[PDB]
Structure 1
Amino acid sequence: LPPGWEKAMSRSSGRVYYFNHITNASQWERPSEPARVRCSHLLVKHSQSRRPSSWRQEKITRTKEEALELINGYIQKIKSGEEDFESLASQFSDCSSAKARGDLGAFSRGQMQKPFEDASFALRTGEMSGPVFTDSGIHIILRTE
């Protein structure tokens, strides 16, 4: 299977699914490197972020666990189609790139924080990550190119 995938078993349904330990994505279907990729992201900061502040809040006080719960809720609505990634990023991302619907532009290896970079380059074009942890906080990453 493609870089970083493994089989797993649903605890609730017993049905097999697939999980990527680089991007933290999970899916039911069996899944099937460039100089640069283009990604958007939605960042949720927490009280141990490297800079716990953003355009949304002068003092970000939420815990890491609380930030993960927010991230998980956003992923759920994106995957159900109730909301779009671009819409949630514009409204709730703690990165100034919120004003660009989360778009970071194109980048090479070496420029971003390593867990972010590895998830970005392991996604297929159009793919979304699960929660990705860095010193900035927790991200949802969408590879657009």
Structure 2
Amino acid sequence: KLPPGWEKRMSRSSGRVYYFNHITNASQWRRPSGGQGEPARVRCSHLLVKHSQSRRPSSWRQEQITRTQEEALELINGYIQKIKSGEEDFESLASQFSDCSSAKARGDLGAFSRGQMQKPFEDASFALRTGEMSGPVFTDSGIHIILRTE
């Protein structure tokens, strides 16, 4: 009925219905749809927020990442909120705040196939449809927001 990963959920805090993708961790009020499988290749941009437990706790933004995983998640959630509100743009935020060297490419990672990225990153990327944005995606590098561009 719903595309891969998508399920109809509701808030324990409130009670309002929404839609959640358990592969990309994306959430949205809009129903995600009104033998195709996955695309064989995708192109994605991403915004990475590292933390003290990241595999390399350093980046061009600071040689010593000291924020906790929770503080990194709170930053990721804030960036998602700014993008969804329209106040900020994904590429603009990735250029300024991504702890990945791809920030110089506005977050662009180019095209990739299965078996080339970290498994949680890969699973989310191939579950996004073109133009869709993930929720928080947890890898050994940190927490990502992923935007599928092709």
Query: Normalising by the residue count of structure 1, what TM-score does the alignment of the two structures yield?
Result: 0.97
Instruction: Quote the residue 1:99 is aligned against.
Output: 104
Could you give the per-residue CA deviations for residues 10-53 of structure 1, whole angstroms, max 9, x where no partner exists?
Answer: 34542211101000001112112211000000000000000000
SS in 2 for 1:42: strand
Matches of 1:13 and 1:58 in 2, distance apart? 41
Q: CA deviation at 1:116?
A: 0.1
SS in 2 for 1:99: helix
Q: CA deviation at 1:85?
A: 0.3
SS in 1 for 2:94: helix
Q: CA deviation at 1:7?
A: 1.1
SS in 2 for 1:130: coil
Query: Normalising by the residue count of structure 2, what TM-score does the alignment of the two structures yield?
Result: 0.94
SS in 2 for 1:97: helix
SS in 2 for 1:18: strand
Matches of 2:14 and 2:26 in 1, distance apart? 18
Q: CA deviation at 1:6?
A: 1.2
Q: CA deviation at 1:57?
A: 0.5
Instruction: Quote the residue 1:89 is aligned against.
Output: 94
Instruction: Quote the residue 1:18 is aligned against.
Output: 19
Matches of 1:68 and 1:75 in 2, distance apart? 10
SS in 2 for 1:79: helix
Find runs of 4+ consecutive structure 1 residues off by over 6 angstroms.
none
Unaligned runs of at least 5 residues, structure 2: none
Could you give the per-residue CA deviations for residues 61-86 of structure 1, whole angstroms, max 9, x where no partner exists?
Answer: 11000000000100000000000000
Matches of 1:72 and 1:143 in 2, distance apart? 18
Matches of 1:12 and 1:113 in 2, distance apart? 33
Unaligned runs of at least 5 residues, structure 1: none
